[PDB]
Symmetry: C7
Subunit: 190 residues, 7 copies
Amino acid sequence: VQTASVIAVLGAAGLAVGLALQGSLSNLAAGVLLVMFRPFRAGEYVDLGGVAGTVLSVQIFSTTMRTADGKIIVIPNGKIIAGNIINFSREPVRRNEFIIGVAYDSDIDQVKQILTNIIQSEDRILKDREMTVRLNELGASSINFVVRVWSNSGDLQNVYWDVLERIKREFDAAGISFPYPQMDVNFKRV
Amino acid sequence: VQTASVIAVLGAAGLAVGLALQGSLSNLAAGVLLVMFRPFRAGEYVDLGGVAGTVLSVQIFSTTMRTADGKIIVIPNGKIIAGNIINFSREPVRRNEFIIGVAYDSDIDQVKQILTNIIQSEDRILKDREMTVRLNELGASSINFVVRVWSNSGDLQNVYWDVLERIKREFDAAGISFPYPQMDVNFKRV
Amino acid sequence: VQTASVIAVLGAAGLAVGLALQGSLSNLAAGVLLVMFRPFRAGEYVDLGGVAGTVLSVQIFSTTMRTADGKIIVIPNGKIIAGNIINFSREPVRRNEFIIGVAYDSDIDQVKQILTNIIQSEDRILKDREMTVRLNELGASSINFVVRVWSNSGDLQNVYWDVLERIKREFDAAGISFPYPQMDVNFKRV
Amino acid sequence: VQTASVIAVLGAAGLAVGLALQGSLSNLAAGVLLVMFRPFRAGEYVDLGGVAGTVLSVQIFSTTMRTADGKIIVIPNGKIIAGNIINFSREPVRRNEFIIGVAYDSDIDQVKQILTNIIQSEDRILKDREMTVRLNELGASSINFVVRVWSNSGDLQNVYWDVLERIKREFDAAGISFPYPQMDVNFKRV
Amino acid sequence: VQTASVIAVLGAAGLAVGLALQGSLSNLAAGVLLVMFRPFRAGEYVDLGGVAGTVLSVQIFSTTMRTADGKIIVIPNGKIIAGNIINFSREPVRRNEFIIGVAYDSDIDQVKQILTNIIQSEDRILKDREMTVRLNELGASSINFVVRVWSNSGDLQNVYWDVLERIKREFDAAGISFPYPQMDVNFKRV
Amino acid sequence: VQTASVIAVLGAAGLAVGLALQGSLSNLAAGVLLVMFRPFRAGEYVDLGGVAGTVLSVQIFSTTMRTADGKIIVIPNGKIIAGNIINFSREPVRRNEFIIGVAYDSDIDQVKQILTNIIQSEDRILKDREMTVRLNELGASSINFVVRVWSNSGDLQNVYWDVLERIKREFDAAGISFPYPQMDVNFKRV
Amino acid sequence: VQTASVIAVLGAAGLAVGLALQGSLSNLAAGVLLVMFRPFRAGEYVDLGGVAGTVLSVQIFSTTMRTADGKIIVIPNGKIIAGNIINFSREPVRRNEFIIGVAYDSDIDQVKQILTNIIQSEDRILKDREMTVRLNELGASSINFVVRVWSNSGDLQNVYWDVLERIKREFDAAGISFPYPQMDVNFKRV
């Protein structure tokens, strides 16, 4: 009959209902934020929360995306806002990174010259950007050269594959050897 | 006799009861949201939060699923909406990935040609989609080729197994060798 | 003498008491939810939160389980619902997974035939379900075959052990060899 | 002079004081909960929150335990109730696990027979419980047998040590060899 | 018709809406905080949340950064405030670290002298700062020296590459050898 | 002019200020709790939060401690009461652990006898407590024996060092050999 | 027109704004707390939350530090108090730790005598503090000795480097050898 216990228990029930809606309400707020700022739109290859693919559509509660191999992934908007966004289509030009390990005894300037010839021969490589072919690091078993090449995002993978194959062919022709993991022993007969 | 301490303690009890219901209320809210949006329904092979299988049924509090090995798992809906969900039946066609390591001295174009012949021989491979047979990377002990092949989700595993067996047979016939991890030594008698 | 500071401090004390009860109230709510939905009952092998065993009984505050080796573990219900739950007795039939590594030179179809003969010989194997014996993958030092066998949950371990022993004996008899990790070396005296 | 700002600021101070007491109040609530259900008492070997030892006494704020090496550890009761806690004194009988690696060429049934003789020789081994001596797994360099033996909790360690020593002596006497990590090499003179 | 249930339910709805806005409001507060303290501004190379790049622009809700390879990353301001932020352009001069591993029998003072000559030869090295060339550590297979060189941020990478190439050339000329992973063996042929 | 918006906004500001003080108030509450239970007092060797050393003094907000190497660490009391604390000085006697790896062919009982003689010779070892010298584990390359020795906390490290040196000397004198990592090869000329 | 819905929605907006300011207000409270206790001050080398350097200045919202190599780091104060803080400059004298691995056959007391002579010869070593030169442990491939040396914080690194170089030179002169990773083989011709 008291008017205080009833209002207290209804307030407790209301806060419980709010805490229940918590997940869905947070996700829908995240989704409406995403749509009204549109950092990324449907149909462009991107990466969200560590998983990459083309987003088919974005919904109020979550988003639907398809990776390269055909996985259909539904990601709740809360994680998109919590996580990072890695957009690919925003920049038409990107950069490929080749790491080539060669033997210690192999000539240095010869490798740089042949790599420069290879990259200059390729036409899909953006010549305006830097053509980086430098001795990167002195590895445990082989010295590693680094190659940074800028090219359009559309033909990035094809450029990578063609450059790698040409590198293999030219290295085989020129006698430069890709070394297996080296190691040396010391015999001690007992 | 005071009417303020009693209402205060009843309010504290009510908020405590709400915080008690927290887990069950959140889980049931997530479950009803999933039911009323239905990213996936019962009877399709999917993966939730890292565990995969066929969902037998979905309940208000959690969901029941069977792993490929007959394992029965109940997953709370709160973690489902908090986690990532991926579906297999949504996309009828998926893509298999083969990674084949071959010795450095092995011929390059011959391997590509024989792999293309193998994939063309198979009929369950979708001809409309791409057939990527390219050099992928120069590994420490062997050069790795990548093969990306699209096929229907129903027969994906069978296509994978048959392609792998045919690859093994053809490589053995053609003399191409799968190399063991190479090592280099340098004798130093003391 | 003020009637506002006193009600404020009593309200603060009440919310503090609620936040104190937080753990016990959440755990008891979780336990009552479990008992009134009974996803699992007492006396059947299960796995909660990564630790597995047979539950002796379930209480309002936590649950009591006995591990295979005899560990007595009491698990709070809150983390039981927070984490996943695995059940064994729900599905009377499960699937065993054998992975067998063999040398590259070993015959392929002979191994498949002998494995099929072995699994056919065993009677506890459920013949209605699939009996997969396929080349699974090309390992670094040995090709690994996969065997999937469906059998009743009661005799799963015994079937596994008997199949493994028979595999060992038949492989020894037939000349098939389990290869040790294979390396290859290149001598170059200095 | 306003009566609303003062009550508002005192309420804010009260909730701040409650959030201050948060840790101590939660810990004492957990402690009293553990006291009045007493899943474990003082003086028996247990493992709480990943650290094992004999609990000396339990307090309202935390618990005091002594590790086997003499470390004195004080654990807050909140972490006690949060994580999994296990007891060893609850079950008078536990199970020891032996993993014995032997060479591929070693006789199978001979090892099983000698292990059965060893376990039958020991009297502290519970005869009623199972005596599992089966080929467990085919390891990379050796085949591993599993031995599961039930015995009283008090003499578990002594049984383990005596069984291990007898296993070593019997294996040395019978000619069974514990293999070192086996390696295979292939010479390539260049 | 009651005036208490309606206000209670509207208060619950309002707190639910606030908990929905939670993420957006926190992120916008973080962004405005960043704007009005400007720890970093657009167009300078920075590294936040573990990802590095040039800040193309800063928005109220998030920040847009271009990675060195051309990647576009959108980072919510909540991560910037919560995580650590690192700046490059704030300090015009930085320090390059070189770790060089040599043979155990190689001369010590000769290496230090040649390294000092190398660093003195370079002009972009800031001579006012220290030029640390000391025996750092006695590694498992080689002794490692550390070189610390201070130079302007603009030419840091070029200085690093040129110094490394000159180190390689001078070491080859002087006969100092970079040792492969050493490991000796003992023969106990049965 | 409204008297409701003003009280609402002042209440919001008050709860914001409470959330501001949250960390400092929690830390000071934890500190005063630790002071008034004093689980550890100033000037004793302890370990908390993964860092060990002697606490110089404890403050209301945090604590000041010095590591064995002279490091000065200030640790917030909140994380102290959140984590686990262990005290070296509480127990005057602790237990030292020795793990000794010996060859497979080495005599078993001889090693146990010589270790028992060594520990008997030492006087700082508490003879009342157990002195365990038993075979412990069958390693991949060497069998590991276990030694548990109880001694006063003051001379624990000195006892450890002296016992280790005596073990080394006695093993060298008696012909027992500490084996290098063993490994087996199988030549296969091609 | 109702006076209850308006106050409810304004209260919800106020709590939303409070939760928005939450991060910045918590950080500023942490910063002012640090200032008014000044556990560390500008210009002294310290380590906060895992990143080390000299703090240039401390602000209300965060702090600015420059690492050894010149990176500019902005650390929020909330993370500062959340994590540990260690001060190098508070204690004028610290302790360097050398670990020296030597062969099993090398003399024990000779190495200790050499190390004692080396540390005694050095003058920057604090003679009042202990000079620990003891056999630390029996490594897998080499026995490791530990050397603990106390010296002023200013010349700690120089003392370390000079001691290491002198150790190398003296060990080379005395014939003591730093062993490469040992390993043993067993020939098994097939």
